[PDB]
Design a protein around this ligand. Structure first.
Ligand code: HEM
Ligand code: HEM
Ligand SMILES: Cc1cc(N)nc(-c2cc(CN3CCC(F)(F)CC3)cc(F)c2F)c1
Ligand SMILES: Cc1cc(N)nc(-c2cc(CN3CCC(F)(F)CC3)cc(F)c2F)c1
Ligand SMILES: C[C@H](O)[C@H](O)[C@H]1CNc2nc(N)[nH]c(=O)c2N1
Ligand SMILES: C[C@H](O)[C@H](O)[C@H]1CNc2nc(N)[nH]c(=O)c2N1
Ligand SMILES: [Zn+2]
Lengths: 413, 418
């Protein structure tokens, strides 16, 4: 009936009642925790499956606006039911769509940026029918979100799933990523994470510049048709050349990154409806770029390069040359974005804000599901306040969800 | 049967050992509690002296496990041990472990410690039977020998000293210190805190028991030892047994002038060791430090020594905003310094890269021969530079195997004085 979480640095204790509203698996059992497991078409919901999911969401939406039990609430409910009876599915109103998209972000236990959840620009693209249409919608998203460096968070929602045979999909995992090319000598040019997607693009006819920071083309699928290539207009892709405020040589590494993090491979679930193409964007925390993108061994792997220029002893790990070069890379990233007036947040500010957000969510909502394994930044963990903050993890809906990669299930026409 | 995947190597391991899990983790299908410090209160035995139907099944299970370990099970010595444990509980409401059973159980408690990154060495543990102990003086003698053996003039060795098991609950043996060696914390009149803030309350009890504090920043605390439920007694560990390392920096000549030191021997002394239903309330165990425990947590936690600003100021760092990452930069230098100092003084220490790499290897070993290895991601990943260590990218399954080390309440919330 109640659960308590404690911050071990501050002694603050919060009481989670909201977890009673969750209704879907975490992956754990009573005797084994799967808290660190990353992921613990005909599966479209039947009529009888969809009825209670829509009732739940419509009830939740009318509760949120202090109209529960109202005439408008009850008529909406039977209107939804009629659609499900006739058409085996239903259509959200614009208000419900905006509410669902904002709450799916609010409910994202792994996102540390949720203090901003209520300031989200929703772009209703449910009238889209072609890949060309999707490209137009996505170009307008990118230009709005980027806002000349003064980033604004936003989502564009494409038509919901029907029978699973007519999905809309953004095949890109983000709207802006760099290409990756495996060389014959075993080495990799560009971003090793995107090698397979780069190969899918090329075979579809993309002519790659074969460089280190080639912005990839969009690969867009509408209504279950084969996906199509489109080149984002270069003037819409804002990029930051990475330099260091004290190390003159750092600009000579030749590094840049894009300004706009825009995840496009997830699935938005509102009231049992599945929005298979729903790309969303915000702004970066510095460590996403500085620690993971640049320094993962499977990613750009520049630690060794930077330590060399730093003149560090790299013969023994206990010199902490890796830790040292990592801090400088992350200083360079934050300094570069700030100098070019492109929105960014360091891990300290971001985690402190999330703690403020968590306490408020407990205050007014009864809790706030949170995934410690993801909330804690990938460097300097215990000197950030979330490290010392107990967190409960559960799955509320609307939610953002993973889905399989399109090329693992699409059958080509 | 569950799989775990490492996302750096794509190695996938397959866990069947979790089918032997006994106690609740705290999680359910609908709520994960994997970042709660004490998620469960599910114990294997009720409050005080258990009835025969309560203790015997736990006993039978441990003995079954142990004889299974040595390729008996059903052997003559196994069936006689069952009858011996049964007659013993019938006649005393408890039973006593053979020497071999005690050693097997302590080593497997360590092997089962999901939060411990050090378990590659689990089977190389020195076990000191102190179950004949009767007084706090005896407990001090045993602890001194432990510390001396374990320290080994800086070539540290792993050890545990096991004092008599809990009988009725009003006769517990307890080390009141949380570790055998810690520094005092003193509440200053101006509201600040001198020494280690974590130990302010234990330091007060010591002072309140007659300890004369030297009132410094690194005052080794006295032992506060409780035998057979009686009042605890203060003892000063002979200083020549308390190895300490003065912290200096391989490049910053000014670092030594910060006047920082730490001790060499981490010896956890407030935990409970549970073997076949038996509860060893006093079982101090020790190994050697991972550098980050001292340099990240002990020195840089806000509720601890909090030395970040002072090191950052000495380094001439832009301390007016977070985004300069001055905290992160000082943090790295401190950990370079702690490591360099322990190594210069030839005192055993391991950095977080070496230690996490070893644990991945231990994991591969455990799955290969045991069918799994319980591990708590939240505690295994180091508190700096997490994602540049291999355990960050390693999925882990957490579950509670027995024998185990458990938490227990601080004795001063529970003890009736006399
Ligand atoms: C406004 C600034 C934002 C910041 C600073 C931020 C920060 C982060 C970070 C650091 C992660 C982990 C990413 C990783 O480590 O790979 C994350 C995850 C996530 N973000 Fe946010 N985020 C922001 C905005 C948004 C928005 C606008 C949405 C949706 C409308 C969103 C939805 C999510 C989701 C669903 C995840 C987790 C995906 C998963 O489960 O893997 N975020 N966020
Ligand atoms: C020999 C080298 C060892 C290393 C490097 C090591 C490392 C660690 C570290 C870093 C932690 C986390 C502590 C914290 O962050 O507060 C830990 C936890 C733990 N260690 Fe080990 N350890 C070692 C030996 C041992 C031994 C000999 C035992 C018992 C016989 C043991 C039992 C435990 C237990 C039970 C925990 C969890 C304590 C808790 O749940 O609060 N360790 N270890
Ligand atoms: C809006 C937003 C802001 C921000 N700073 N960051 C992200 C983000 C989120 C993921 C999570 N992401 C899910 C898809 C996946 F493919 F499953 C892999 C994990 C990954 C990233 F690279 C990201 F930049 C998103
Ligand atoms: C043998 C050993 C080696 C090593 N390198 N480290 C530790 C250790 C373990 C904790 C865990 N500790 C338990 C008591 C508690 F009260 F439960 C709070 C958590 C704390 C430390 F400071 C520690 F040095 C132990
Ligand atoms: C194995 C582990 O689950 C995996 O590395 C997780 C850990 N925590 C993370 N946290 C964030 N923010 N992003 C990640 O990709 C991961 N990866
Ligand atoms: C809230 C969180 O569970 C708590 O701060 C944990 C996190 N992980 C940890 N990991 C280690 N090794 N030691 C700790 O004390 C903690 N503290
Ligand atoms: Zn769990």
């Amino acid at each position: 009936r109640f659960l308590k979480v404690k911050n071990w640095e501050t002694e603050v204790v919060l009481t989670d009642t909201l977890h009673l509203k969750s209704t879907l698996e975490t992956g754990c059992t009573e005797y084994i925790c799967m808290g660190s497991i990353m992921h613990p078409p005909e599966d479209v919901a039947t009529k009888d499956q969809l009825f209670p999911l829509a009732k739940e969401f419509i009830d939740q939406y009318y509760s949120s606006i202090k109209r529960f039990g109202s005439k408008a609430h009850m008529e909406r409910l039977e209107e939804v039911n009629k659609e499900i009876d006739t058409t085996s599915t239903y259509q959200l109103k614009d208000t419900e769509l905006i509410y669902g998209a904002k709450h799916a972000w609010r409910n994202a236990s792994r996102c540390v940026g949720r203090i901003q959840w209520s300031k989200l620009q929703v772009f209703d693209a449910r009238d889209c029918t072609t890949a060309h249409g999707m490209f137009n919608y996505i170009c307008n998203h990118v230009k709005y979100a980027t806002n000349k460096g003064n980033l604004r968070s936003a989502i564009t929602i494409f038509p919901q799933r029907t029978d699973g045979k007519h999905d809309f999909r953004v095949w890109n995992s983000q709207l802006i990523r760099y290409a990756g090319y495996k060389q014959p000598d075993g080495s990799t040019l560009g971003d090793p994470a995107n090698v397979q997607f780069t190969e899918i693009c090329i075979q579809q006819g993309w002519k790659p510049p074969r460089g280190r920071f080639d912005v990839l083309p969009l690969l867009l699928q509408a209504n279950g048709n084969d996906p199509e290539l489109f080149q984002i207009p270069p003037e819409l892709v804002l990029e930051v050349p990475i330099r260091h405020p004290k190390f003159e040589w750092f600009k000579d590494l030749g590094l840049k990154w894009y300004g706009l993090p825009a995840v496009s491979n997830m699935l938005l679930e509102i009231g049992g409806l599945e929005f298979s193409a729903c790309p969303f964007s915000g702004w970066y925390m510095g460590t996403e770029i500085g620690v993971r993108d640049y320094c993962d061994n499977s990613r750009y792997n520049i630690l060794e390069e930077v330590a060399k220029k730093m003149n560090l002893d790299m013969r023994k790990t206990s010199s902490l040359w890796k830790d040292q070069a990592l801090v400088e890379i992350n200083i360079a990233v934050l300094y570069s974005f700030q100098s070019d007036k492109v929105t960014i947040v360091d891990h300290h500010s971001a985690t402190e804000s999330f703690i403020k957000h968590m306490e408020n969510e407990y205050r007014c909502r009864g809790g706030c599901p949170a995934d410690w394994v993801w909330i804690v930044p990938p460097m300097s963990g215990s000197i950030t306040p979330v490290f010392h903050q107990e967190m409960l993890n559960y799955r509320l809906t609307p939610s953002f969800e993973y889905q399989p990669d399109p090329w693992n299930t699409h059958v080509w026409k």
